[PDB]
Design an enzyme around this catalytic site. Structure first.
Site, PDB file in Angstrom:
ATOM      1  N   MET A 220       0.581  -1.050   0.049  1.00 13.71           N
ATOM      2  CA  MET A 220      -0.005  -0.042   0.000  1.00 13.71           C
ATOM      3  C   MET A 220       1.037   1.200  -0.106  1.00 13.71           C
ATOM      4  O   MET A 220       1.955   1.297   0.795  1.00 13.71           O
ATOM      5  CB  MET A 220      -1.061   0.078   1.238  1.00 13.71           C
ATOM      6  CG  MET A 220      -1.251  -1.399   1.495  1.00 13.71           C
ATOM      7  SD  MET A 220      -1.629  -1.776   3.214  1.00 13.71           S
ATOM      8  CE  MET A 220       0.306  -2.326   3.790  1.00 13.71           C
ATOM      9  N   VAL A 223       0.904   7.041   3.343  1.00 10.48           N
ATOM     10  CA  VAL A 223       0.096   8.457   3.503  1.00 10.48           C
ATOM     11  C   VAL A 223       1.080   9.196   4.376  1.00 10.48           C
ATOM     12  O   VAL A 223       1.502   8.535   5.491  1.00 10.48           O
ATOM     13  CB  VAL A 223      -1.181   8.473   4.063  1.00 10.48           C
ATOM     14  CG1 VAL A 223      -1.517   9.842   4.234  1.00 10.48           C
ATOM     15  CG2 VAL A 223      -2.167   7.615   3.105  1.00 10.48           C
ATOM     16  N   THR A 230      -5.939   3.053  13.390  1.00 14.45           N
ATOM     17  CA  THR A 230      -5.941   2.529  12.149  1.00 14.45           C
ATOM     18  C   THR A 230      -5.948   1.025  12.323  1.00 14.45           C
ATOM     19  O   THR A 230      -6.755   0.246  11.284  1.00 14.45           O
ATOM     20  CB  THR A 230      -4.678   2.683  11.346  1.00 14.45           C
ATOM     21  OG1 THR A 230      -3.496   3.071  12.454  1.00 14.45           O
ATOM     22  CG2 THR A 230      -4.858   3.976  10.687  1.00 14.45           C
ATOM     23  N   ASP A 232      -7.433  -0.777  14.764  1.00 11.25           N
ATOM     24  CA  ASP A 232      -8.642  -1.150  15.165  1.00 11.25           C
ATOM     25  C   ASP A 232      -9.662  -1.377  14.102  1.00 11.25           C
ATOM     26  O   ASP A 232     -10.297  -2.333  13.773  1.00 11.25           O
ATOM     27  CB  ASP A 232      -9.184  -0.217  16.307  1.00 11.25           C
ATOM     28  CG  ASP A 232      -8.238   0.029  17.353  1.00 11.25           C
ATOM     29  OD1 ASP A 232      -7.642  -0.913  17.935  1.00 11.25           O
ATOM     30  OD2 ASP A 232      -7.903   1.274  17.644  1.00 11.25           O
TER      31      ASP A 232
HETATM   32  N1  ATP Z   1       0.274   6.048   6.543  1.00  7.90           N
HETATM   33  C1  ATP Z   1      -0.418   4.954   6.352  1.00  7.90           C
HETATM   34  N2  ATP Z   1      -0.263   4.796   5.010  1.00  7.90           N
HETATM   35  C2  ATP Z   1      -1.300   3.754   4.297  1.00  7.90           C
HETATM   36  N3  ATP Z   1      -1.562   2.912   5.109  1.00  7.90           N
HETATM   37  C3  ATP Z   1      -1.691   3.207   6.597  1.00  7.90           C
HETATM   38  C4  ATP Z   1      -1.099   4.027   7.111  1.00  7.90           C
HETATM   39  N4  ATP Z   1      -1.367   3.984   8.518  1.00  7.90           N
HETATM   40  C5  ATP Z   1      -1.989   2.833   8.639  1.00  7.90           C
HETATM   41  N5  ATP Z   1      -2.284   2.239   7.514  1.00  7.90           N
HETATM   42  C6  ATP Z   1      -3.094   1.172   7.352  1.00  7.90           C
HETATM   43  O1  ATP Z   1      -3.772   0.989   8.567  1.00  7.90           O
HETATM   44  C7  ATP Z   1      -3.895  -0.520   8.643  1.00  7.90           C
HETATM   45  C8  ATP Z   1      -3.221  -0.854  10.085  1.00  7.90           C
HETATM   46  O2  ATP Z   1      -1.916  -0.198   9.821  1.00  7.90           O
HETATM   47  P1  ATP Z   1      -0.634  -0.412  10.788  1.00  7.90           P
HETATM   48  O3  ATP Z   1      -0.122  -2.023  10.656  1.00  7.90           O
HETATM   49  O4  ATP Z   1       0.408   0.466  10.752  1.00  7.90           O
HETATM   50  O5  ATP Z   1      -1.300  -0.613  12.451  1.00  7.90           O
HETATM   51  P2  ATP Z   1      -0.872  -0.816  13.625  1.00  7.90           P
HETATM   52  O6  ATP Z   1       0.604  -0.634  14.020  1.00  7.90           O
HETATM   53  O7  ATP Z   1      -1.509  -2.029  13.985  1.00  7.90           O
HETATM   54  O8  ATP Z   1      -1.553   0.383  14.365  1.00  7.90           O
HETATM   55  P3  ATP Z   1      -1.523   1.079  15.675  1.00  7.90           P
HETATM   56  O9  ATP Z   1      -0.302   1.487  16.036  1.00  7.90           O
HETATM   57  O10 ATP Z   1      -2.348   2.524  15.368  1.00  7.90           O
HETATM   58  O11 ATP Z   1      -2.317   0.399  16.602  1.00  7.90           O
HETATM   59  C9  ATP Z   1      -3.237  -1.215   7.710  1.00  7.90           C
HETATM   60  O12 ATP Z   1      -4.078  -1.929   6.806  1.00  7.90           O
HETATM   61  C10 ATP Z   1      -2.193  -0.133   7.001  1.00  7.90           C
HETATM   62  O13 ATP Z   1      -2.091  -0.229   5.370  1.00  7.90           O
END
Ligand code: ATP
Ligand code: ATP
Ligand code: K
Ligand code: K
Ligand code: ZN
Ligand code: ZN
Lengths: 309, 305
Positions: A220, A223, A230, A232
């Site tokens: 992906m 951003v 995110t 959740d």
């Molecule tokens: N900056 C970003 N750009 C693109 N997709 C993102 C971004 N931040 C989060 N996502 C999307 O959100 C989902 C969860 O992201 P990620 O794996 O970073 O979460 P996480 O570390 O579990 O979240 P958190 O730290 O907030 O609990 C993924 O599907 C990811 O693609």
């Protein structure tokens, strides 16, 4: 008729925990029973925050009420961030009791503990939670959605490549869950440095004792902003789509990741507009634009293809 | 882009208080900040119930968090069932503070009083709350949704006819709210004894006044949270049709009819034959009425009085 029991945090303003998960599942058709593990004004990303927390005893009280009324029947249990081990242990007792009554129950678990914030890796929770996640939560989970750091911690092994990632996911399958998705990694992606790489795996035991494993990779475009809630939102939509496509992790992940892309594009667009030109959007301005993304969450246009490994 | 601060009860399972109001507002396009005044396992229509209540000091601690972060800017405030006069008073303070910050803010209030089934583990609403509503709440409210019994208490008058109602409604306007709606009355609809009558009134400082009446056929069941669903959707529709209370109510009442029909049909389907539906089977089919809430087919015509 599908009922989900979601035990996560609640915030008056914003989207995190049960706030990030309830609306999506509701527009997708699921009946959501929500236990709020806490109630704050907003998430911890803001400079201030106030609220109350629930202890494992209050959690048990709420469950006893469902039990006493004979309405403790669920198709899914969904949990995320938890700060105290008693609470988490209490959740396992609950999941186990429910699975005793519905062998078909699916436990979706997001083992929240930390990340590597752009080469910055540390914990969000007490070191004493990992043993509980390892020995008591993972074993009864059916779907887990850890990020690299959480996958490394649960298996005690470090990931330096796509190959080691798959080995770690196998070790996780061996711990219990048939479905594993590493939502994000520090792994360099073949499409470019600006792409985030996710990986998924779904194990299936055949009648003859043979084992089929579908593995997929997803890339992906990043951003440039730090969002909250995110993981959740991801876990919540993955639950819905895996439900519709039970034996197709590929399509479930594509629909889930596409929806994320749509929600975030709408969020960064509105945040920059609200903060003026040049100025960096604040946590308050970066709150997920959940409500305005309704249509995208219901039927997302696919914009990412999963590569089958 | 509109933001609503809804302070009401939360129940793990079922729909009452904030559970009955949030989903509806969210699908209608409103940003909803929800403060859960309590958190119980289910509503009081069930045989059992467990949970905890949030005290006025805790409510202030939450609102303060929003204040410190300068995110306490709202367009609407929505409240309902409360059994604590101390909590109710804290709500009034919070509203006046918000109104000074945004004079355009609209406060929608459903003054619940009585032996109502609710989500705050209570069996009744303390009599000592009446004087709080009368003197502190109503003067600050912009839209109120009392039922006949409640309207009678807030005005000391008793309603015996349709003219009597309009008489009480006028008194309510003078007390503060520009929009009043008696959601249900003992009044006998000319239409038949099986129709529930609802009356609505709205003032506009052109000062003009629009009065309306609606007949709704009774549904042979007892529901919980309907009053909360009503106020929440009335809020949304009044926003989209600011000077047309007729259209606003027509959509609100129609949506209501669709939800209840879908609810009673499924309840009888899930219960045995000749078996009366239980409170658990009667929980509102909210999630499944999504399309009916977003765009309800009009099934009622409000007569202008
Ligand atoms: N900056 C970003 N750009 C693109 N997709 C993102 C971004 N931040 C989060 N996502 C999307 O959100 C989902 C969860 O992201 P990620 O794996 O970073 O979460 P996480 O570390 O579990 O979240 P958190 O730290 O907030 O609990 C993924 O599907 C990811 O693609
Ligand atoms: N049995 C029913 N048949 C038809 N409509 C009903 C029925 N019960 C409630 N309603 C509808 O629900 C809305 C509120 O009704 P009612 O006057 O019972 O509310 P209330 O007293 O505010 O509710 P609560 O039970 O939450 O206190 C109205 O639009 C009303 O027509
Ligand atoms: K995750
Ligand atoms: K009412
Ligand atoms: Zn996470
Ligand atoms: Zn009522």
């Amino acid at each position: 008729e599908c009922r989900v029991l979601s035990i996560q945090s609640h915030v008056v303003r914003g989207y995190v925990g049960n706030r990030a998960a309830t609306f999506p599942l509701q527009v997708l058709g699921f009946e959501v029973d929500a236990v709020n593990s806490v109630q704050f004004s907003n998430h911890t990303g803001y400079s201030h925050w106030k609220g109350q927390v629930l202890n494992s005893d209050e959690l048990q009280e709420l469950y006893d009420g469902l039990k006493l009324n004979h309405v403790n029947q669920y198709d899914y249990v969904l949990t995320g961030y938890t700060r105290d081990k008693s609470f988490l242990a209490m959740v396992v007792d609950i999941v186990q009791e429910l699975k005793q009554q519905n062998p078909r129950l699916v436990y979706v678990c997001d083992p929240v503990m930390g990340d590597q914030r752009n080469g910055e890796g540390a914990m969000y929770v007490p070191d004493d939670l990992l043993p509980v996640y390892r020995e008591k939560v993972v074993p009864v989970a059916d779907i887990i959605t850890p990020n690299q750091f959480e996958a490394e911690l649960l298996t005690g092994r470090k990931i330096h490549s796509q190959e080691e990632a798959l080995e770690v996911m196998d070790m996780l399958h061996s711990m219990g869950p048939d479905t594993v998705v590493i939502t994000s990694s520090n792994l360099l992606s073949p499409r470019g440095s600006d792409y985030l790489m996710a990986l998924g795996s779904q194990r299936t035991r055949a009648p003859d004792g043979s084992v089929v494993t579908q593995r997929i990779r997803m890339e992906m475009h990043k951003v440039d902003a730090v969002f909250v809630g995110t993981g959740d939102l991801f876990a919540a939509m993955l639950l819905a789509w895996t439900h519709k496509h039970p034996n197709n992790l590929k399509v479930a992940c594509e629909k889930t990741v596409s929806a994320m892309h749509h929600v975030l594009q709408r969020t960064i667009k509105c945040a920059k507009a609200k903060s003026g030109e040049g100025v960096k959007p604040s946590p308050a301005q970066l709150e997920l634009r959940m409500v305005q993304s309704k249509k995208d969450i219901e039927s997302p246009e696919i914009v990412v293809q999963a590569t089958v490994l």
